[PDB]
Write a protein that binds this ligand. Structure first.
Ligand SMILES: [Cu+2]
Ligand SMILES: [Cu+2]
Ligand SMILES: [Cu+2]
Ligand SMILES: [Cu+2]
Ligand SMILES: [O-]
Length: 505
């Protein structure tokens, strides 16, 4: 296997605007097929990248900054990854659309799966409205990320490399003196399988392919043999002996991580998907499912000279391998101090979400289920509805709802709601057999409130097997057509995604 910790961690450059005034910031990003070396000992890898980069450029904006991004497709007309033609039914093979994950975004700028476009916008999906996306950023400072969201192609386009970080800075938070600038570093974690010739491997069929299956065939999960951070296999980062802020983004298709430091040191979590937690939380380890973000401080002050591995204990299709996927990256505390560490790790970060006293307009009960197709494949479904079925999740703008998510399946699903961030209420175990047999919900234990990590704002939430998860969301400020889905991309594409109409009656 590839030698761990021989390549320095890339830090994506921050994107520069094409045009910028005090009223408007205008960006252009072009999707390009390019080649990049992912490891010292590999031939360069063919990839799809925003501005030809993997990950894409980091975009930095201020809260309320009036931002526009013209996301353009200049990709080849044929994919290099295996397309399953059976999962969706002239129309180009390669379709793309950029979704700003966590963006408080008007619906036609949200990257609707059917708002896709081919090269130079030559063909467009039935929900396409505009070339230049509008991000008003009227929302909390937070770690967002952008990625492809095209109908039936998301797992492939993202795996190809179409991911990048987007950071909203709220000037009100500068007073907290969190590590900033060089000491504030995104970590986009993506697992990959890479061939000896350096080409990406993505399976064209399940491991034991029934002759019933089409070819290629979608698979229900993907687990990469190797872990990359910021587009390099098992990299090292030289750090100064002081506090750093890391924006930890899980940009992987399926894989969930459970992260810790191999010296037993702590993380300080300061933020979740929707922004700063009310209070900082000291943690030894944390779970990170696809699309989840952890805003953390790591204090290297007392660890000068040391090599510390960011370790992973979560398996993917099996137990972790100590030599491979148990490793993420390596910090080397050997960079001389550029100046005094004037950063802080404050306890008091933000207003509590519980300060809000909104009326519960509606309680939605939603089940995570599915069926089997003509080929014997699992088709994962939200409420046993297909994507194309008439919309059922129709919250009213400006109203608050409780969603009760029932998971009678064998695994966890990271459920993502577009537009909004929500509060986690509780989780409660139930009798799976009883529910499967009769549709009756019989709890086998008391409700458990969220851990401190989940006492802030979330947008992607782990709904564990055999539990009912309750969340509360205020739907707004925009009305329109959005989506909610499982963020396991292999699930999302077949067919664990539903329209969400935020209505203005
Ligand atoms: Cu997403
Ligand atoms: Cu999203
Ligand atoms: Cu799922
Ligand atoms: Cu999405
Ligand atoms: O998403």
């Amino acid at each position: 296997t590839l030698e761990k910790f021989v390549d320095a961690l890339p830090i994506p450059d921050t994107l520069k605007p094409v045009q910028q005034s005090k009223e408007k910031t205008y960006y252009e990003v072009t999707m390009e097929e390019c080649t990049h070396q992912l490891h010292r000992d590999l031939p360069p890898t063919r990839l799809w990248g925003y501005n030809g980069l993997f990950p894409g450029p980091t975009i930095e904006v201020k809260r309320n900054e009036n931002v526009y991004v013209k996301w353009m497709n200049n990709l080849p007309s044929t994919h290099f990854l295996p397309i399953d033609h059976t999962i969706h039914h002239e129309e180009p093979e390669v379709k793309t659309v950029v979704h700003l994950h966590g963006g408080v975004t008007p619906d036609d700028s949200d990257g609707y799966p059917e708002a896709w476009f081919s090269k130079d916008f030559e063909q467009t999906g039935p929900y396409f409205k505009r070339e230049v996306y509008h991000y008003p950023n009227q929302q909390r400072g937070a770690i967002l990320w952008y990625h492809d969201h095209a109908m039936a192609l998301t797992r492939l386009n993202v795996y190809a490399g179409l991911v990048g970080a987007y950071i909203i800075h709220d000037p009100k938070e500068k007073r907290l003196k969190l590590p900033s600038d060089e000491y504030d570093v995104p970590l986009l974690i993506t697992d990959r399988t890479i061939n000896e010739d350096g080409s990406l491997f993505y399976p064209s069929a399940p491991e034991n392919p029934s002759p019933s299956l089409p070819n290629p065939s979608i698979v229900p999960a993907f687990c990469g043999e190797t872990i990359l951070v910021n587009g390099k296999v098992w990299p090292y980062l030289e750090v100064e002996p002081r506090k750093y802020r890391f924006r930890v983004i899980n940009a992987s298709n399926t894989r969930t991580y459970n992260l810790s430091l191999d010296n037993g040191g702590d993380f300080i979590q300061i933020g979740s998907d929707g922004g700063l937690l009310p209070r900082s939380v000291k943690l030894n380890s944390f779970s990170l499912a696809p699309a989840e973000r952890y805003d953390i401080i790591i204090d290297f002050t007392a660890y000068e000279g040391e090599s510390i591995i960011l370790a992973n204990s979560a398996g993917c299709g099996g137990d972790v391998n100590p030599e491979t996927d148990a490793n993420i990256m390596q910090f080397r505390v050997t960079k001389p101090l550029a100046q005094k560490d004037e950063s802080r790790k404050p306890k008091y970060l933000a207003s509590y979400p519980s300060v809000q006293h909104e009326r519960i307009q509606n309680i939605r009960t939603l089940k995570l289920a599915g069926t089997q197709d003509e080929y014997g494949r699992p088709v994962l479904l939200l409420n046993n509805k297909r994507w194309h079925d008439p919309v059922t999740e129709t919250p009213k703008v400006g109203t608050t709802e409780i969603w009760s998510i029932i998971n009678p399946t064998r695994g966890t699903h990271p459920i993502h709601l577009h537009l909004v961030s929500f509060r986690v209420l509780d989780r409660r175990p139930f009798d799976i057999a009883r529910y499967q047999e009769s549709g009756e919900l019989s709890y086998t234990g008391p409700a458990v409130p969220p851990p401190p990590s989940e006492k802030g704002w979330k947008d992607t939430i782990q709904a564990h097997a055999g539990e009912v998860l309750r969340i509360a969301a205020t739907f707004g400020p925009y009305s329109g057509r959005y989506v909610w889905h499982c963020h396991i991309l292999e699930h999302e594409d077949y067919d664990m995604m539903r329209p969400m109409d935020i209505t203005d009656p």
